[PDB]
Ligand binder design. Structure first.
Ligand code: CA
Ligand code: ZN
Length: 388
């Protein structure tokens, strides 16, 4: 029970590789083959909008982009941050999806996977701003984005679904494969090529503008090639891959903390079964093919006791370790409590673990057994029941 206590709008925030509504020919990240989640929510009286930030970027960059997309304006990554990592300070300019957040309004954020880290960071920056950005701005006499001031509280709630709050060991597998096939560098080169091809961005927009991957106006190929080789993007830790790794996720948890003015809900996922002999976990029949063959095996068998990666990390949903989903724990002081019928502020409300994989939970992969429609409508109702 507990009816409508607020009419604050909802924004959907995708995770790693996530694309916007106008990309992928309309195939929705939030809905996939099952439908259009944003539309189902809107048709039911829940004002909903969809955010589309850097699919391969760091949570910091994605948070800054999310902020601009919400209140409108030109993306400002921060002069200190831009200088530190070697990329442009300013980005794209947006009209604003919810400028009402600038004058009292509040918003519910529903995020999937990496989106969970971005949402938490946006809240932390809004609330505390960035001391480093403030000091840098005053010391060099440059402008400061309101986002780094602190004292803002327009986010009412953050709901994470299958979010790797403590990271995912999948990155560890990528580290091993790096000795040969370097996945990140390959993805970047592909993005570099695409940035120069005409219509590509209409299908999949990499949103890596800050790195200047495309050949500029009168730039010759020769100059272009030389400039790219010198780019710091190839060896940068200012990427989603780093924030998603075990050590990167902890560093994020060290400063991104749960705000006492915001409600936090987490949903965990698993689509595996434990081997009686080894203790290792294997993908159930149904998990999307990609995950089942390429990711699940490593996720369900990789251990590193010295780093704290024990048997409790083997259960997974094909992409992320389940134990990493209930809330930040590694390098975190956040509190996680089991949902007891009453949602609380400043803590993670563990809404439970669901038998659906990483892609099925957003409809990208089919699973007739999963009533995706009901899951999101039921979530919307709970968010609407929250007391401001
Ligand atoms: Ca399936
Ligand atoms: Zn950055």
């Amino acid at each position: 029970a507990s009816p409508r206590a607020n009419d604050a709008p909802i924004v959907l925030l995708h995770g790693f590789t996530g694309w916007g509504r106008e990309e992928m020919l309309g195939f929705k990240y939030w809905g996939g083959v099952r439908g259009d989640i944003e539309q189902w929510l809107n048709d039911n009286g829940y004002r909903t909008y969809t955010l589309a930030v850097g699919p391969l970027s760091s949570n910091w960059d994605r948070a800054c982009e999310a902020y601009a997309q919400l209140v409108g304006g030109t993306v400002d990554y921060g002069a200190a941050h831009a200088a530190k990592h070697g990329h442009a300070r300013f980005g794209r300019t947006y009209p604003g999806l919810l400028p009402e957040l600038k004058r009292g309004g509040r918003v519910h954020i529903i995020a999937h996977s990496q989106g969970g880290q971005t949402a938490r960071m946006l809240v932390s920056l809004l609330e505390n701003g960035s001391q480093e950005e403030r000091e840098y701005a005053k010391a060099h006499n440059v402008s400061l984005s309101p986002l780094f001031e602190g004292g803002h509280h327009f986010v009412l709630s953050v709901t994470t679904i299958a979010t790797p709050h403590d990271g995912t060991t999948l990155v560890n597998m990528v580290d091993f494969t790096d000795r040969f096939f370097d996945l990140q560098k390959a993805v970047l080169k592909a993005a570099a090529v695409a940035s120069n091809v005409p219509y590509t961005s209409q299908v999949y927009d990499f949103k890596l503008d800050q790195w200047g991957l495309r050949r500029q106006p009168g730039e010759s190929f020769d100059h272009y090639f030389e400039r790219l080789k010198r780019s710091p993007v190839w060896t940068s830790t200012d990427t989603a891959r780093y924030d998603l790794s075990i050590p990167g996720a902890e560093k994020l948890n060290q400063w991104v903390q749960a705000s006492p003015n915001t409600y936090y809900l987490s949903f965990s996922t698993e689509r595996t079964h434990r081997g009686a002999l080894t203790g290792n976990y294997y993908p159930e029949l149904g998990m999307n093919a990609f995950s089942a063959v390429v990711c699940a095996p490593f996720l369900g068998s990789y251990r590193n006791e010295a780093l704290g990666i024990d048997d409790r990390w083997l259960e997974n949903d094909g992409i992320v370790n389940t134990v990493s989903m209930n809330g930040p724990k590694r390098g975190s002081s956040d509190r996680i409590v089991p949902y007891d019928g009453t949602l609380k502020k400043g803590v993670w409300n563990d809404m439970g673990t669901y038998n659906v994989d990483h892609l099925e939970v957003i409809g990208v992969d089919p699973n007739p057994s999963f009533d995706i429609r009901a899951f999101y409508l039921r979530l919307a109702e709970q968010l609407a029941s929250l007391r401001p």
